[PDB]
């Protein structure tokens, strides 16, 4: 309930934040605080300093820059949910509860890397990229490489996520399916789908799975089954089956969860198609 004692830094600008973090290996930055503060309260972390990055308002923004959306790291769930990015907005909508989405940010969700988070299912499906900033400058990496393991982002002391990039997916159809015992919970299983039709052929298809592995994965087999094919009942059923091949879940039951991957992939294809 009660955090441990820690120091606190309110830096004037980004440069200052970065330097303090460089020099203080075990200082943690604070964004929406909806994963950091709950962890302080249970005393599962004990940093020397919390560095406040929240007031850098030029880190909060949705920009359409050609055929990329550029999303400031400090952009909240709520604002992403309101901004018409195919798949991603609907996925943000599902996160936690209204109060949670009012504060939580995309930069903090992906820097935290809970293996049941919502965004990674959408972000892996989207081939999202992560702009990482340093006093040294910027590194852009693929979402897939950024997510090194549960709770293990590709971030060094001294650096912050400043931006998430995704293609614009115009004319794409999409669905985020979230299995949950109660409104507000993290995903028991999450399936994020993007596809685009050329006539009745599936021209592109992307399927992301969350809460069923240590990090988010592509449902490669479900993709193979659908890509380039003309849609009918049979292939949908088959793709939904093959999505189970990418699920390595943990005991609901591990077996129940694997079965739910098929159920939610089917719901995703059918919802996006309708």
């Amino acid at each position: 309930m009660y955090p441990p004692k820690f120091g606190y830094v309110i830096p004037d600008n980004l440069n200052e934040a970065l330097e303090f973090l460089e020099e203080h290996q075990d200082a943690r930055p604070l964004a929406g605080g909806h994963s950091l503060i709950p962890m302080l309260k249970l005393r599962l972390i004990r940093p020397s300093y919390i560095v406040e990055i929240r007031r850098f308002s030029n880190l909060s923004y949705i920009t359409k820059d050609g055929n990329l959306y550029k999303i400031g790291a400090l952009t909240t769930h709520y604002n992403i949910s309101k901004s018409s990015i195919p798949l991603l907005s609907e996925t943000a909508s599902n996160i936690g509860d209204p109060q949670v989405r009012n504060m939580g940010t995309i930069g903090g969700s992906i820097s935290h890397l809970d293996p049941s988070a919502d965004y990674p299912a959408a972000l892996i499906a989207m081939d999202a990229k992560v702009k990482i900033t340093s006093r040294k400058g910027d590194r852009v990496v693929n979402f897939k490489s950024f997510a090194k393991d549960m709770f293990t982002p590709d971030l060094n002391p001294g650096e912050l996520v400043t931006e998430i990039q995704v293609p614009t997916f115009e004319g794409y159809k999409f669905s985020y399916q979230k299995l949950e015992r109660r409104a507000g919970d993290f995903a028991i299983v999450g399936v994020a789908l993007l596809l685009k039709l050329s006539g009745d052929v599936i021209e592109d298809v992307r399927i992301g799975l969350t809460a069923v592995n240590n990090v988010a994965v592509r449902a490669k087999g479900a993709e193979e089954e659908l890509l380039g094919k003309r849609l009918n009942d049979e292939i949908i059923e088959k793709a939904a089956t093959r999505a189970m091949e990418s699920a390595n879940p943990t005991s609901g039951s591990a077996e129940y969860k694997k079965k739910m991957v098929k159920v939610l992939t089917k719901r995703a294809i059918i919802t996006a198609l309708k």
Binding site: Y2, K5, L179
Partner: protein, 701 residues
């Protein structure tokens, strides 16, 4: 008249404007904060280094392991040490410095194992078995002789946790002569008796301030309350104790947790003849306050097994057994839900085995008229079960043609326990009236019902009747709020005191007018038409040395009054195994309804708890005796999304109680009916036998 009207709550104004005062909203000068160190093991010998700001069980109950463990701890979550600091943040820092030496002992989690006495829950027990009696009634031999068939299985009613949104909490201050103790409790007067008994002196004032619910979890004095109180005698500063919610989950409000090994004897036409088997109830660790609470509840479970049916004999072997977990306590219904759940599941299991209709089997077996004494000696006092079921068939028929699966159950219930209850009413010289109840409402809205009762008796506007409770200094005494007794027993005390007041106002009025009629507080000479006003009577009572402050004690001579009803649900299960409840109908007979708005409000709150037990909740331990569900994420009480889309509540008054209010209790009825209603519904959709709860998603796919 106000009685019978949906009068809106006099309680709401303070609370919707955030001007309540729950225990943690109270402060005294120099208040210190108290936290408890708790056992991380199910069963261990302990040594705790006493240090500055660090107290141990020896400071509280030397030579005993309860309320606070001194040599031997018997459950994860048991208090083993007490820290004191300047504030809550520093208190929890100080917790991390406490030095505990553990010797892990062997422990038992399963009450079925435990009853073999192979491993003792505590060193000094003769037996893990706290209670063991064979319950027999009617002619069980004849039942099983005459049966065409018998059916057997084991039904589980799993452990749950009360989880009121406000935790326990308390504030204790001893001035040198007198202890004042504020607590999030279900009764100030009962907590005072508990503290008087534990501390050995009478000069104790208890204050129940606003309480954020309890659902049975705050009847008993908890170990922390005894300890805080004893510490306050020693330290001479006010001491505030508020557990974290993790603490609350691990240490308090565990209830239910009963198993029935049953065999039922039936005729092929769905006649239920008799039952036998073994009831095993899990008391968890031996804490006397909790054991005593829960063991009375074990008896409620057995005695209600015959339900509303014309059973011919039964033979049930009842065990209440300790295990190395949080001691078990009353939770909403306090044994009655388990017993009704058992009979209503069995009834459906039979219906399903014999291809009989779930409604028809109940109309077949239902008691005809009341009064009736069940097989285990419970007298169902008034009403008409069959007739209420005929009324309810019309909703069953409607639901049967909608899309989804129907479940029904019928319940009968015991309420309005004694031994007595108190009410004081007083009138000041200027005319102000205050009514005080010895009950202790904590959300149920009885004070509005009390104000409706007293205003009808006095014939005054309801805004004239301020209603107070929860301070041992403003009323002679009280029992409390539990066993759905408050509007019935506490309201009957209110009716007596108001009547005494009216009788007194009459004779002073008569004296003033020379004679021996009352209307709206005024007294008039029934020809010559001379009149003395309410306010003139009151001022003259004072001048005449005549007091208008009166206290009535309503002693309860009758046995518990018994409501009954039939509830119905329509559900759907999807391809993920998630259950959706479309509709729920409750038909109840609770005697005179004092306030239909508040009564329905109780029905609905209970219904959603009963549904949540069927579908969501469960308190489970890993094999190290650690509770797996210790927060509102992992212990899933429902949000607004998980409720039935609509719950329609109806009442019929076919049977009144013998009490002056005519009312029976409803505080618990919803939670009793909803669980098997919902389970019967889901079972219709699946269709395998459901033997345990909550129903998991993976069990329905």
């Amino acid at each position: 008249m106000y009685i019978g009207k949906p009068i809106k709550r006099i309680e709401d104004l303070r609370l919707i404007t955030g001007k309540g005062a729950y225990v943690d909203d109270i402060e005294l000068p120099g208040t210190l904060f108290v936290a408890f160190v708790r056992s991380k093991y199910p069963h261990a010998r302990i040594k705790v280094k006493k240090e500055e700001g660090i107290f141990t069980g020896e400071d509280i109950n030397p030579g005993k392991d309860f309320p606070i463990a001194t040599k031997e701890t018997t459950y994860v979550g048991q208090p083993i040490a007490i820290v004191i600091a300047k504030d809550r943040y520093e208190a929890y820092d100080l917790i991390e410095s406490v030095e505990v030496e553990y010797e892990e002992l062997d422990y038992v989690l399963d009450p079925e194992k435990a009853l073999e006495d192979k491993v003792k829950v505590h060193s000094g027990l003769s037996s893990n078995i706290y209670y063991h009696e064979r319950w027999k009634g009617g002619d069980v031999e004849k039942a099983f002789k005459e049966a065409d068939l018998t059916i057997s299985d084991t039904l589980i009613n799993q452990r749950v946790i009360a989880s009121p949104l406000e935790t326990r909490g308390a504030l204790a201050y001893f001035d040198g002569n007198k202890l004042t103790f504020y607590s999030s409790t279900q009764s100030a007067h009962y907590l005072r008796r508990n503290l008087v008994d534990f501390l050995g002196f009478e000069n104790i004032r208890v204050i129940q301030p606003d309480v954020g619910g309890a659902f049975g979890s705050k009847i008993i004095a908890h170990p922390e309350e005894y300890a805080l109180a004893k510490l306050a005698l020693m330290l001479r500063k006010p001491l505030k104790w508020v557990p974290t919610r993790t603490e609350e989950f691990i240490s308090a409000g565990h209830g239910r947790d009963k198993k029935l090994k049953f065999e039922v004897a039936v005729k092929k036409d769905g006649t239920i003849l008799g039952i036998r088997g073994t009831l095993i109830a899990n008391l968890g660790a031996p804490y006397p306050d909790a054991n005593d609470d829960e063991s009375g509840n074990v008896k409620s479970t057995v005695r209600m097994l015959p339900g509303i049916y014309k059973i011919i004999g039964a033979d049930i072997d009842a065990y209440a057994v300790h295990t190395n977990i949080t001691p078990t306590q009353s939770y909403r219904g306090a044994g009655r839900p388990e017993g009704i759940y058992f009979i209503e599941r069995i009834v459906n299991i039979v219906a399903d085995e014999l291809g009989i209709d779930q409604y028809e089997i109940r109309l077949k077996n239902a008691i005809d008229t009341l009064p009736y004494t069940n097989i285990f000696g419970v007298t169902y006092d008034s009403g008409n079960v069959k007739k209420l079921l005929e009324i309810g068939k019309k909703y069953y028929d409607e639901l049967k043609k909608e899309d989804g699966c129907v479940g029904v159950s019928s319940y009968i219930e015991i309420t309005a326990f004694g031994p007595w209850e108190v009410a004081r009413i007083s009138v000041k010289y200027d005319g102000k009236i205050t009514l005080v109840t010895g009950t202790g409402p904590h959300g149920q809205g009885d004070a509005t019902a009390f104000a409706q009762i007293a205003a009808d008796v006095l014939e005054l506007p309801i805004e004239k009747i301020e209603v107070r409770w929860g301070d041992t200094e403003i009323i002679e005494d009280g029992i409390g709020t539990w066993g759905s007794r408050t509007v019935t027993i506490g309201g009957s005390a209110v009716l007596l005191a108001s009547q005494k007041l009216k009788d007194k106002l009459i004779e002073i009025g008569a004296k003033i007018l020379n004679a021996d009629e009352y209307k709206e507080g005024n007294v008039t000479h029934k020809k010559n038409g001379n009149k003395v006003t309410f306010n003139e009577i009151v001022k003259n009572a004072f001048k005449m040395g005549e007091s208008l402050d009166t206290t009535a004690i309503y002693n309860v001579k009758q046995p518990p009054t018994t409501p009954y009803g039939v509830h119905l649900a329509l559900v759907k299960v999807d391809g993920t195994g998630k259950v959706f409840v479309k509709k729920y109908v409750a038909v109840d007979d609770v005697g005179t309804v004092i306030n239909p708005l508040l009564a329905e409000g109780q029905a609905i709150g209970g219904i959603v708890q009963g549904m949540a037990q069927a579908l969501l909740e469960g308190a489970f331990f890993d094999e190290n005796g650690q509770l797996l569900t210790t927060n509102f994420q992992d212990y899933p009480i429902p949000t607004a999304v998980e409720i039935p889309e609509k719950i329609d509540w109806y009442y019929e008054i076919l049977g009144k109680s013998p009490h002056p209010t005519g009312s029976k209790g409803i505080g618990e009825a919803g939670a009793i009916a909803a669980t098997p209603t919902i389970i019967n519904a889901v079972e219709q959709c699946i269709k395998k036998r459901i033997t345990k709860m909550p129903v998991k998603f993976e069990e329905l796919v």
